[PDB]
Structure formats: structure tokens, C-alpha cells
Amino acid sequence: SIDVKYIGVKSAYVSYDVQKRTIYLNITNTLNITNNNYYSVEVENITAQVQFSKTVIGKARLNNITIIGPLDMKQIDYTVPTVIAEEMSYMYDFCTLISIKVHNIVLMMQVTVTTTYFGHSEQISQERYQYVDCG
């Protein structure tokens, strides 16, 4: 990456800002900007690049061979009983939540078993979070 920017309200190269109840009188503004940007990113010179994978089996006796990749989820139990009993009562539930297995951004990058990788990998995940706003 080069320029990652997070701004809460206002981003401005040149900002002449005037707010309320302002007497803006007799202003003379002169501005010169000479901006140059030069970027040389991911410039690659490879004369040769080799990837080789070889598997040879000969006169072999293989048994019970078991290979399991990543992310092996087994025997998972989620239990949320919710019993509510009334007896001449007064319930005011304005903002209540029951949440299980909640995802916003889930990025997987090259989840495999056997990998031969050459190159560039970039991940950007920038945000703002407001899970609860209950007046």
C-alpha cells in the first residue's frame, strides 16, 4: 500500500471554511499550487522464475493414509434456551438483542493444503463499527 487514509469528518487539500454568524468582509486571497505525484509501484523485472512440484511413488505399500486440511470444524454445539414467564407484570424492552455467529467482514486469502505461491498479496479492511445505537 501507499496511502491509507481514515478521516472522521473532513478531508481537504485547501479549505477556506467559514462558519455561522460570521462577517466576511475585505478578503483578498491568492493561491498557487504546483503539485506533482510520481509513483512506481509493483515494478518487477524477472528474467526467469521456476515452480516445480514432483511426486513419485514406486513399489510402495500405503495404508491408513489420511490427510485433513485446515479449518476442520467438528462436534460444534450452540445452545441458547430463552424462557420468559409473566405473572401480572410490566415489561418495557426498548432495545434488546440475542446474537450468535455474527460476522461483518470475513476475508480468506489462500487457505489450501499444499500451496506454491509467487507474487504479491494485499488485504485492506477499513471501516467504522456501530453495533448498538439504542435511543
Ligand X SMILES: *[C@@H]1O[C@H](CO)[C@@H](O)[C@H](O)[C@H]1NC(C)=O
For the segment 50-69, give every residue that binds a copy of itself (CB under 8 A): 50-69
C-alpha 135/C-alpha 125 separation (Å) is 29
Amino acid letter, residue 111? V
Query: Which of 45, 49, 53, 121 contacts ligand X by CB under 6 A?
Result: 45
State the binding partner of 61 from a copy of itself, ligand X, none, CB within 5 to 8 A by kind: a copy of itself
The answer to whether the CB of 113 falls within 8 A of the CB of 69 is: yes
Query: Which of 1, 11, 22, 26 contacts ligand X by CB under 6 A?
Result: 26
The answer to whether the CB of 52 falls within 8 A of the CB of 65 is: no
Amino acid letter, residue 66? T
Q: How far is the CB of 82 from ligand X (least distance, A)?
A: 41
Q: Does 36 bind ligand X (CB under 6 A)?
A: no
Rounded CA Rg of the chain: 30
Q: Of the two residues 34 and 89, which places its CB atom closer to ligand X in the complex?
A: 34
Amino acid letter, residue 36? N
Q: Which residue number is nearest to ligand X in terms of Cβ?
A: 32
Q: How far is the CB of 52 from ligand X (least distance, A)?
A: 24
Q: Does 116 bind ligand X (CB under 6 A)?
A: no
Q: How far is the CB of 33 from ligand X (least distance, A)?
A: 8
C-alpha 54/C-alpha 28 separation (Å) is 75
In the DSSP assignment, the letter for residue 42 is S
Q: Does 11 bind ligand X (CB under 6 A)?
A: no
